[model samples]
Target: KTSCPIKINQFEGHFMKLQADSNYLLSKEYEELKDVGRNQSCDIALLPENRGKNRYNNILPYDATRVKLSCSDYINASYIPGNNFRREYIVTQGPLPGTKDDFWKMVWEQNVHNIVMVTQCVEKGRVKCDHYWPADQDSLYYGDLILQMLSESVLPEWTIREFKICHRLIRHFHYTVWPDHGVPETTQSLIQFVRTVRDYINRSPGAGPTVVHCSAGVGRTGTFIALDRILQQLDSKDSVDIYGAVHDLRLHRVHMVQTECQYVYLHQCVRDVLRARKLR
Candidate 1:
């Protein structure tokens, strides 16, 4: 596995802690949001905030492409920051600051050709609309695109259900998410998502990389990225040892796969993916 060339500073530590807290809060809020099950018409996917209360409005003010967010809202959105396995992609969760109109403009301004907007409701009953262009958003017809309106009602349980929903939603799109929390369920779901992404990449022509983020996009996202790179190496001609993979991950995201138990779960996930894939 490749090592993180740069060392993260105290700012990173603060970022990780903030990410941890955001994950905790997101999990709780998701539970509350789930309990209400009001299904606020999911026009916005709720993302846990990044470290230092870094709002989406300010994280990468100068370089629009510097940060790709996998957010719930346009502002205060959550996202993953690292480059994907393909080294050409990043996922943005929502639009930037401003009203929905302005946010869409930003998306267009960013030269974001592919857009996925997972919403619960729409102005019209039609789930498929040409919000971006004349072509339907669901169809992979437009080079610049939009994926609008995948109802959150489909998944009631925040943990198991949402991951699957997200996996399906992002199968073709190039993007990523930094999850708020880590658990057996989340880890397993991530492994599955990675497989889905890889499969999509393998099939697509000249596809960019997928980007992932949690709150900080370092710890949880870093962990996932590290594992992903390691797994790819394992499958590649030049494979990386599992221990080396974990070590490199720590080098990049200090607290990646932090707990020993979590680390063990990661290994378990690797085994599970291998077994499942082999069976398939």
Candidate 2:
């Protein structure tokens, strides 16, 4: 088994510390980000005609690093750089029915190798995300990009699907356990899911940024990125700074790690990994 960076003894204490300071940490970072005027011009995002294209009315992708679709200039996706992973993620909302083609086109144009979906198509009888990929058929054509479902493996908490696109292979790790606007019941599965995606990214160093999305592309997506960066730093530098990691992410994209619960869940995930490794 591979050695883990988080020691249980230290991580547990760290988790408690974060838990105690989460409100202050999150508020300070939020105020600092606001003061920085990190919010970019999103006039295109506010056009009334494009309103239905977004999952949430308030959350919109930043204009600076937003992904431009070849078919249409309107898509709710933003390029977000990881603290240690560099430009490793294109954070976006779950696709709407009208934007599915644009979604695939962005994937192809951006050369994204992996997509980490942290929300379900429907939650609590509400439609969260449109079915953006061909799950049943061998192949599906979305505009000019041909997507073929090469293989799929379903795990207890998630599904790993491999697809062939324009002669290139890409992986999609769909995490189905997370609830809408809520953290998972347990952090163990979420940690494992993120680790799996990170391992894939590590193996394919030259591949494009991994696309990550949730209903609004802020809550769960932000949490996942924050935790991933924290673990990456711990593994490579033997240190962790959740506050700095999330603060950096919000600069690229707004409202990351949406709620205090999601913020605390990040610490819970780190604790899970440390406990799993028996680092205590």
Candidate 3:
């Protein structure tokens, strides 16, 4: 059961400020993040007027401001010029301009023979078994199951090669009571994981992007990326505005880190990233 009408705020030392009628959570201790290049204040509050209700179930309204439809693709490449490559991680920015078919054609042109296609399953019985990657493929990292009410077939896949796809879990895995499970600790673990990934990418001499995914490829994935970018910005003394960063991500991809829980995880991850002495 998914709930809506949740709000989240991102800042240096503060957890995302969540507000809902009669169920608001105000921080007992708010520490201002003294980071050099990070946001001095948090903004962009999400207001979910209806909880547990699917507003889009009955509407297909389109907003011109929102960039809709997203997907993923991966391939093995020999050489990619201008890519910052190392042993652990391969970092690349954006896609080369081309039509969908031409973009993939270029991948093959790069001698990328090993290809994997990941698409959302439309209906319970309508899954395209022929296009699905085999579970035992050694090259296969993981498969993400996006959790949303929309039909899966409608989502388009982003074309790229020589990268990894981080899979997402469908349905609520397990609900933990906050504070009892130590949300801060869990957040630290996630931060470490992402930093490790970033370090690996920076160290690897690879040819594609490290693709991260969740149901909508926005909320969890977006939050993770935003947090990572924020930490990197802070570490390198680069300018970053949490609200603007998140807003930009939302503009590029809808629902980037939607839930309050996911937002909290992002906040914790940022803190953990900075506290780690080693880029492990």
Candidate 4:
């Protein structure tokens, strides 16, 4: 409902003002994100069998955009549109022991060429995402589909892997440095990781959306998708529309940018990226 636009030519001017504003949030400028997420209706999630399919009690996908399973049915995953109305990404929770099969099915059924995981299998003794993929150089069966790991490489802030799913190669990018509830004060490395992920997607455009998930599929996943959109917006329009970008996201899924900390980090992350670019 709001543009809140900031073009790159004046990005620093717009950003530095917010940086020193003492309380950039105190103003009603970000009022669009102030409402409780529960206000949005998710009737499909309330259906009997769909209850247990969700990772969190309340973080459910709205029926309107929830990815449909071949029949099709439920998955706690939403089809998030990017730059255009095209399905740019699939947002879902970490695969639970019970839902891993469903996760793979979605990827297979959707023809996803890439998967972006933003959390580790275990975080601070808590199981964030179940071990859904076979270890490097191994193959496993999820129902009838054979998921074979082609190879893997552990990079600075993330891990990259190739998996053979239903005879097609799927690229998996895992960002391990994202703390569940903690936002890094400096996000330059985080920005770099997403840049690499986007670069791979750009180089090899696929037939479907990239599958993305964290634990609840809200915090880091939303942040990542928002950056993806924001970065693209910068390229096409030279404008940063975090407000409009997030408003669009919230309409598709609940709690897109989960907290003020994350909400603020989006602004800082883009500012820093543009600052570095201005040097070139």
lDDT against the true structure, each candidate: 0.37, 0.78, 0.32, 0.81
Best by TM-score: 4
Candidate 1 vs 4: which has more lDDT: 4
Model 3 regions lying over 4 Å from their true place = 1-131, 137-185, 238-240, 272-280
Model 2 has an lDDT value of: 0.78
Query: How much is the lDDT of residue 24 in candidate 4?
Result: 64
For model 2, residues 106-168, the per-residue Cα lDDT tens digits are 888888888999999999999999988886747878878888888888988889998988879
Q: Please give, for residues 1-280, the per-residue lDDT of candidate 4 as tens digits.
A: 4468887878777766765656464234555565634466788887878877888887888767889888237899988887565688899999999889999999999999999998889998988889999965777899878899888988877889998888899999998788886565467877777788889988876568988899999888988888777877767777788888887778778888777677778888878778878879
Candidate 3, after superposition: displacement of residue 46 in Å? 26
Q: TM-score for every candidate vs. truth? A: 0.42, 0.86, 0.41, 0.91
**Pairs of colliding residues, candidate 4:** none
Model 4 TM-score? 0.91
Q: Sort every candidate by lDDT, greatest first.
A: 4, 2, 1, 3
- Compare candidates 2 and 4 on lDDT and give the better one: 4
lDDT of 3 by residue, 1-280 (tens): 1111112222333333432332244221111111212222111111232111111222111122211222122211111112133211111111212222222333323322222222222324542112222223244322222112211221111222222222321111111112211233466544554465566456545434344432223344456566666666656643334554455444333344445555556545654554464355
Considering only N, C-alpha and C atoms within 3 Å, which residue pairs clash in candidate 2?
A: none
